[model samples]
Each structure stands twice: as C-alpha cells, then as structure tokens.
Target chain A: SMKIDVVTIFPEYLQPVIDAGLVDVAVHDLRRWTHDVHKSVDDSPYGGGPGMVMKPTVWGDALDEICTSETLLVVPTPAGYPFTQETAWQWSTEDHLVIACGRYEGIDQRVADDAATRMRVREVSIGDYVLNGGEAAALVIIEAVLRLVPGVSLLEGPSYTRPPSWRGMDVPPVLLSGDHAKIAAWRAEQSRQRTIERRPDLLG
Target chain B: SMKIDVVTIFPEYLQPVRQSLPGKAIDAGLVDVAVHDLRRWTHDVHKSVDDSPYGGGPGMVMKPTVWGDALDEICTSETLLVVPTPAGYPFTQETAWQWSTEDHLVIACGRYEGIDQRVADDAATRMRVREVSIGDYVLNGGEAAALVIIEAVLRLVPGVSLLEGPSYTRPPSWRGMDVPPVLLSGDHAKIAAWRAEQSRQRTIERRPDLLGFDS
Candidate 1:
C-alpha cells in the first residue's frame, strides 16, 4: 500500500478525498508551519510580478516534518513539466508521495530546487491551462496516481442505457443484433471515427 | 456578473470552491456558483445514476434520465452547458478566455463512460453546449476536470487575468541562488522583455507546442 500526503492552505478543498477514505492519506494546512499571527505563507514575487509567490521556508518546513527518506515530492504548477498517464504509472511503484499545492503565482522556485537534494522531486502540470490554485491539479494527480498502484483500475464514448430508441435516435440497430464479431468491428470503427473527428492529433 | 452551476455526484469536492476563489468571487458579486448533487434526480432507492452500456461494453454508461432531469431544472436559455469528457475538444487557455465573457455556465460532471449522449443532445436544442477535455489522460470522474475547467474559466473573469512562468520570491538570493540581474534593473521595457523571454523559453522547454498561441 502507498502512503500519500497533500499539503494545501485550503484543506477544505480536499475534504472530499479525506471523506472518501480511499487510501492511506493525510491533508495538512500549509499555514500550520507558520510563526506569524497571520500564518502568512506568501509574499510578493522577487521579480515584481502580477501575483504573490508562496514562501519557500513555509513549504520547506512542512516537508521537513512530513517527508521521509522514501517520500517522492510532487509540486503541481502550470510552468512545471507535463503530467501524463505514463507519469502516473511510473509513480505508482513508489512507497510514499507528498504533493504540495501552490496558489497565487505559485511557490518560490528554490523550494523545489532545495528539496531535490534529499529526495526525488517532480514539478508537474496537469494541463496547459492555468488554475486558481494547485489543489485542483493535486486532486487530479492523486486520482491518477493512486488509481494505478494496486486496487484501482478505457475509452469509448456516445454510450446509452435503456430506452434505446429515444426521441429520434435509435441504438444503432447493429448493437442490438447480438452478433459479437459485428459489434466489436462496429464499435472500433465508431471509436476511430470519433477520434478522427474530435482529436486528430491522437491518430498515427 | 456571471452565474455558474456544477452538478456532480461528489458535491463535497466542489464545496471548497464555494468558499475559496470562486467563493470570493461570489462574495464580490463577479460570479455565482452553485454546487449541486446529481443524485438528487435519481428515483431508485439506490439513487442509481448509471447502468451497463447499450451494445455491451466494459464501462457503465450514465443514464440519460438522471442527467436530463438535473439539467432541465438547472439550465436556462442563456446557459452554456459545458461537459467535461475524455473524448472531447481540447480545453485550452483560449477556450477559458472565450468562456469568461459568457453570462452563465452549467458544467455537467460525468462519471463512468460519461453521461448519456442524449443529455447533451437534448440540452443543445435550447442552449449552447460544449464538451471539453482537460488533457490527453483520463480521470476517475468529471468533478476533477470540472474543478480544472471552473478555475480556468472563472479566474479569467474581469477581475483575474493570470499567467505561466517560473515564479520567485523575496531575498533575491536564496540558498546561494541569485535573482537574475535583469529582473532588478527597474526598466519597464527590459523587465517585460525579460519576463516574456523567460516565460517563452519555459513554455517551450516544458511545452513547445504552447507557443502555438497567437495572443
């Protein structure tokens, strides 16, 4: 079994995952490590930018307390490396995962740079678009990574349930024929057609 | 002001946004988001919202009625129903930027083979509908993608234009690393050029295809 820890200022953002009780995981408020009354975790970017950057020492301290020698640190940010299914598959083999969620302009670059000295650190982005906080990407990353480890476990769309013939559309007739070979071929063709129409880049 | 609604089986997953960024937006009256439970429309004691596929498949297809009822009650003539799915249009910053101008949005959160096709079909008759995917990979449910989409869309509203690049914080020099000299020059033209170059290079190194953006 793999152990996972998610650190975020908005621990409430991850309450759903906590309630799921799906795995051995814990959520920590990033503000917990602060010494200030405001429990401050961010400051203006050193370069004078549009938004605040999450402070490094705050995250460094959180990791110091929680990250074991075996922990693999993951920071989700738009400017980080691409996160794919292959990355998730590779991460599942690890023993522990500590994902740090960054908000505002994102964490100071030195935090990841400094943490890499002791453990494997990965800075990944879920997609090309920007998000209000790392909590969402962290949630998605948790879902993707944990699903591949052991207990968790395709693609085919335009599916239906009952009332096969609804309004003006029917269940394609061939599907109800009960011919296994015919069904497989038809489904594959339809899948290919849909892919070509919707995501041609996926095609070879 | 923009109004938004997100219906999912895991309404708990969205409650945070109700109190965070979008939460703050709601307070400021820039945006209004209502997180709803999809199971509310189910009649069965199990509150079932899914069943086996029509022609036989490994994945369970979401029932149309449950989604249909939920959407009917929630949608309006001006609603732009956004459906997050694996096989859908690639969601990008451009898409988010475009959606920011809309007055209202309804995001349908699908699970297991996605909601019935007719649900989107039926809604299209009265309102604009779009099916968008966050990335090339698959997720457990649309709630996560919905979070991604909601943040991407809502943040671009008049109040929140943002970015992509390496971000640094105070002390200029931290752990022996020095802040690039150009950033401290205090020259507006040079500073912007430096940031654009840094952002451009980082985007290329991480996602070369990202330069595909014209704006």
Candidate 2:
C-alpha cells in the first residue's frame, strides 16, 4: 500500500480532506498521512522581492524529519509539471509519498532541489490560473491519487469486470456487450476521444 | 506577460481570481490572462460523468470529450499546457517567471479521474504538458492552481511593480533573518546583490531547481 504524508503551515485549511466525501477514503484506508505543522520558512528573500518566500533552512528541517527516499515528495506550484489522472494512477502504485504545501511566495528553491536529488521531485500545476497557496493543491493530489490504490476501491461487486452502462449519463455501451475485445476497444476509444477533446496537451 | 487560459466545468468557481488582488493586474492592464468556462465545450447532458463507475465503480469519472474540446480549443502552438493532478510537478515563483515569459498557456482542471488519459496525451502533443503540484497536497479541482499561478506570475509582469514599502520586505522576517541594510540604503547594485543572495539562500534551502533559473 502506498502512503501519503502531508506537511503544511495551515493544516486547518485541509479540513475538507478529512471531512469531505471521496477524499475520506485516503484517511479511512490509512492511505493518507500528515506531518506536524512547520512554520520555519517565512522570511524576505535575501534580495528585494515581494511576498514571503519560504526559507530553505526551515523547509530542509521539516522535510529531513518527515521524508525518505522511498517517498515521493510532491511540491505543488504554478511552475510545476501539469497534473493528470495518469500521474495520479502512477502515484497510487508508489510505495510511499510525502507532500509539502507551500505558502506565500513558495518554498525556497533549495528545498525542492535537495528533495529532487534524493527522491522524485516534481513541480505540479493544477491549472493555468493561480492560487493563494499550496494547501488546496495538496488536497487535490491526495484525492485523485488515493482513490486508485488497490484496496481503496469505492464501488462494490465485480466492479472491475462489469461493463459501462449505455443508458443516461451512462457507461460505454460496449462494456456490457460481453465482448472483451470490443470492451477494451471501446474504453481505449473513449479515453482517446475524451483526451482529444479535453486535454490534447496530454498527448505531448 | 504570459497568458493563462483556464478551462473549467464551473465558470463561477473562477470568480475569485477576477475579484481578488491577483486579478487586479489584469484589470489594470498589467498582465495578459483570462479564465474560460469548461462547460462551453460540452455537447450534451450525458457528456458529464453523472453516474457511478462502470460495474458499480465507486466514484464518478469525467467523460473524455466534454473536457477534450476545451483543451484542444484553448491550447495553441505558443501555449504551455498544464493540468492539476496529485501526481503532477511542484509549482514555485521561479516557475511563475518561466510561464510569465511564455506567450500562451492552457490549463485543464478536472473533477473526477480527470477526464481521461487521452486528454492528457492530446495536450502533450500541442505543447509541453507537465504534471504540476500546487503544493505537496491535492486540490479537488484546478481553481487552486489558477490562483497560485496568478499570485506567482502577477508580480513578475513588467510595469506591475508597486511600491511595497518596508512591509514589502523580501523573505519576510518570519524566516528569522533581519532586513538587509542595502534595501534601506537605496543602493541599486548592493540591493540587487543582496536580493540575489536572499533568493539564492531561500532557494537552496527549499527549492534548488531555482538555482538553475539563475543559470
């Protein structure tokens, strides 16, 4: 089972993860983990800049105490790799994970570089717009990644084997046609067609 | 300045970006950016992921096409494509500088399993598609990423500089460092060097990849 550990300045902002619906699964299954709040990074940049950029010194201490190489330390920022379901699926298979939620001007770049060399460091952006901080971004990653863990199945029955319904806002029709080959094709087509129309950038 | 085009199912959810201090730059003509409605691309009611997964799957996943059009339309040759996912890359101020320098950007925010893999692939072909993390955690949608981008990028836009005063001190005192004297001295060379050191030290401790930004 993969583990998700979160480190943030405002844990209270993440209350939705604990009190929400599907996200509850991460905590319910013990797939979600959290670290104590670390407030050591706030300070002005050595040079003149706007807003508070986190200090490497504080971030290093927090991460050293909370993360290990076995864990993928996720840092959510606008200047990161774009996020996707495929990425979440990959994370679901990881053995362990730790997340750092940045605030103000963001964590000192050194913290990210160190984590990258020791483990997997990825800069993830949720969208093209902007956000106040990383707490919300962290929650988004947790919800998507935790849902796919093997034991964290949300539905019942041979849900994996059942076909998609064709009726209403239903599942793909071929899923129920009792044709494995046809079903796989349909799923692929659906996945591809959907991507073509929604996120063509994924193909890049 | 860079332009970020957001594609979201709920347009109203983006209102905060337009009304807050972040959007003020755009309103003031300081930056180039906009938020788009994702539902504009939906062709049908059934286009949405309305039911449980196939064969009693636990949660809802988006139908690929509903999100596909928004991505395809918003993305252009000059745009950098991004998506909000748990497993994406981390975001930072330096990154904001990177994106702000770009000509165009398209961001896809998903609700469920995030549309489908196909959408991601499609996005990659048009531009450099990367998985970005706003923080170590996850958000329910891409709205948060949009806000984060705004915060980081708006400040970088040329002509948007404001007199931040003493309160606008870099690496705020919360980080345990006293305000540097060069800043108060009004010596541009000394101030620049000091600022560079501050950025360097902070990045070294928190995000070293930014050091590469200096290169």
Model 1 misses residue B93 by how many Å? 0.8
Find the candidate with the highest DockQ and give its number: 1
Cand. 2 TM to true fold: 0.45
RMSD per candidate (Å) reads: 3.1, 11.5
- Give lDDT tens digits, candidate 1, residues B49-74: 99898788887888888888998899
Displacement of residue B209 (Cα, Å) in model 2 is 11
Give each model's whole-structure lDDT: 0.83, 0.58
* Model 1 spans > 4 angstroms off: A18-22, A152-155, B160-164, B185-197, B212-215
Model 2 over residues A1-204: C-alpha lDDT tens digits?
Answer: 556667765544443343323222221211122222532346675454567876565666667777787778888875565577668878888877777777635676666766777888876765444566676567667766875664450111111211232212344455556787776566566556645544444465
Could you give candidate 2's per-residue lDDT for residues B21-127 as a string of tens digits?
A: 45567778766667776667766675553334452334665655556566666777666887766445456555777876766767777675445545565566657
- For candidate 1, give the docking quality class from DockQ: medium
Worst 10 residues of 1 chain A by lDDT: A148-157
Compose the digit string of candidate 1's lDDT tens values, residues A1-204.
677899998888886673344468889988999868989899887657677988877887999999977889999888777899889888888889999998847898788878898889998888878888898898888888877765640246477787786667676788788898998888788788788877787774
Best by lDDT: 1
Question: How many pairs of residues collide in model 1?
Answer: 0
